[PDB]
Write a protein that binds this ligand. Structure first.
Ligand SMILES: Nc1ncnc2c1ncn2[C@@H]1O[C@H](COP(=O)(O)OP(=O)(O)OP(O)(O)=S)[C@@H](O)[C@H]1O
Ligand SMILES: Nc1ncnc2c1ncn2[C@@H]1O[C@H](COP(=O)(O)OP(=O)(O)O)[C@@H](O)[C@H]1O
Lengths: 341, 323
């Protein structure tokens, strides 16, 4: 009884911010995974639906973060693979069995402990079907993962005969960033616009928001993207993430220990100078961040773009003990204040 | 070994509201396997195969009839898609995986296709119908056994039955003017669709976009017109693998009781029909509702029963709890 859905959401809140709905979904699926394996196929209900996860969100939304923060809190091992280096037919790039090999290294070759492990994959969009231009990075890779997800056994050389390791009990988290998916959903939901007086006048973009647009997604929508329907059928769960809120970004710069403010703060403390960031400058940065349409990953651009001149002349400058950054410095047409003595 | 009456009852256990479709597949599959038990040894040499064509809305149980039938009959079965230049070899090797790469056992298997109307009106559009013609008549395709020998196994395609599933859009207008009446625009002229589909003929399919050569190979026709609102409730109650029974069984091991009143199930029918997706878009309504309850249920203690009301589906109210 180690995992608690009410507690697992509290722990992720410490390392992740801005995604409340997605955290609830993972707690249910994760709890249902071990609840099932506690009594495997012994209940009266036969043909129980398999529990998997499908993370869908924009860039910098925290998809990769949930996979890492979850493994730290969790006891069973965790792996972080990628679909970009995967090939088929034993080519020079990589094989699907490598994911099972890396799992044992984390578990020290414990099959009983490895079957209860977690799996995570990034950049699932790369394996999306494409028209013929041979195409090895595509449908072929999906077939290997499909038979692997549906439950089977794969030969694994122990320590480098082969060992059989069932996979119907192992969890899989296929997650990545889908590009152009919003356009596909728009065609289905928009259904045109009226032109007369009584018609619903449309502005430039009243629905171009991942939130309220991805929640209405369906499995058939992903088929047009390139994925196989049978592959999606094995993942009934879906997790829709929204673009980070401007207020949420502020919290990322203050509460997390790895905040960019704390990073540059220590960067100048070793140099013998203090640093400060007022609240009026944080919200201003959030306005510029959303305009870039990159997420928290593209937040560092606004910071270094401002402190470029300051850092250039700080080592040469002497007798400077503290630096204060005003809101005008971020908007422009101003210079950060410097403290001497 | 089975009979049309015996197989009808088994199908009834997992499927409901489609009576005519059961008799079609029963006699078809019965006579289909009869040819395998006795081939050209009889006077009737070269017994031809009779393909099957399913027509119904989306989420109308088209896939379940093929999937459930496969479980009942101890033979392999795969699922194909009209989306996948020819790209027809993937369907053969996909079947050998379940059959453990067997020639004779696979040859008696069945295959299902979805969205067959998506190609009717280019190598991915009308070019697919032309290619299938030989596949639905008989041929052999190279399939690497085990992936690799430098050899390939031959697997005929005359013994493998095909079921082209899909949902035709706008077909009702074509048959109305041809058979029932030419109307819809005039004053006196008349402005469920199921009854019309029963009177369907291949001539109407030609105007839809299909090729006559393609339709000739599928003389059998099935009409999965619609699913009733009560049937949806029955779908969650009569089948042993219903989702309502799954969640009930999920909490049985937890030591908590579950309930689902009839006043709450009818609301699910409205949301299903509102999405125009059928039974496929059902878990989204249930899982989205019980997400809150499941999230805090383990944390909560001294709770032996849970009741879900109609308001709970909307989300305005909270599911009643029992201590
Ligand atoms: N919810 C979040 N809360 C706080 N910081 C976040 C959040 N999401 C992203 N970040 C920041 O962005 C960095 C990268 O997070 P990722 O999980 O990689 O974002 P991502 O959208 O998952 O990237 P991809 O495209 O999935 S690889 C983290 O190290 C944080 O600094
Ligand atoms: N008559 C029915 N009885 C029981 N379940 C049904 C029925 N019709 C549809 N379903 C449900 O729908 C799902 C399959 O939908 P499917 O046939 O794949 O939709 P589509 O035909 O649009 O692909 C199954 O999980 C099944 O339980």
């Amino acid at each position: 009884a180690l995992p608690t859905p009410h507690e697992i959401r509290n722990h992720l809140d410490d390392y992740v911010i801005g995604q409340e709905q997605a955290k609830k979904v993972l707690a249910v699926a994760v709890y249902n995974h071990y609840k099932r394996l506690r009594n495997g196929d012994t209940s009266n209900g036969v043909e129980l639906g398999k529990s998997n996860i499908l993370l869908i969100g924009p860039t910098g939304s925290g998809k990769t973060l949930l996979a890492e923060t979850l493994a730290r809190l969790l006891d069973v091992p965790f792996t972080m693979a990628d679909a970009t280096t995967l090939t088929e037919a034993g080519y020079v790039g990589e094989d699907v069995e490598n994911i099972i090999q890396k799992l044992l290294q984390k578990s020290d070759y414990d099959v009983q402990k490895a079957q209860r492990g977690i799996v995570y994959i990034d950049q699932i969009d790369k394996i999306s079907r494409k028209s013929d231009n041979r195409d090895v990075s595509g449908e072929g890779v999906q077939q290997a993962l499909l038979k692997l997800i549906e439950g089977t056994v794969a030969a694994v050389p122990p320590q480098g005969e082969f060992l059989q390791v069932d996979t119907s009990k192992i969890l899989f988290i296929c997650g990545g960033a889908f590009a152009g998916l919003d356009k596909v959903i728009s065609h289905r939901v928009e259904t045109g616009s009226g032109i007369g007086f009584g018609a619903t006048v449309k502005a430039k973009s009243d629905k171009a928001s991942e939130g309220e647009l991805l929640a209405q997604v369906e499995p058939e929508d992903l088929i047009k993207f390139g994925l196989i329907p049978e592959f999606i059928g094995r993942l009934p769960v879906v997790a829709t993430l929204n673009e980070l809120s401007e207020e949420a970004l502020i919290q990322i710069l203050k509460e997390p220990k790895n905040a960019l403010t704390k990073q540059y703060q220590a960067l100048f403390n070793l140099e013998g100078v203090d640093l400060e960031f007022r609240d009026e400058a944080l919200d201003a940065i959030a306005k510029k961040a959303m305009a870039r349409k990159t997420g928290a990953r593209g937040l560092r651009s606004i910071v270094e773009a401002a402190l470029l001149d300051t850092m250039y002349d700080l080592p040469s400058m002497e007798d400077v003990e503290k630096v204060v950054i005003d809101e005008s410095v971020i908007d422009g047409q101003s210079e950060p204040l410097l403290i001497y003595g």
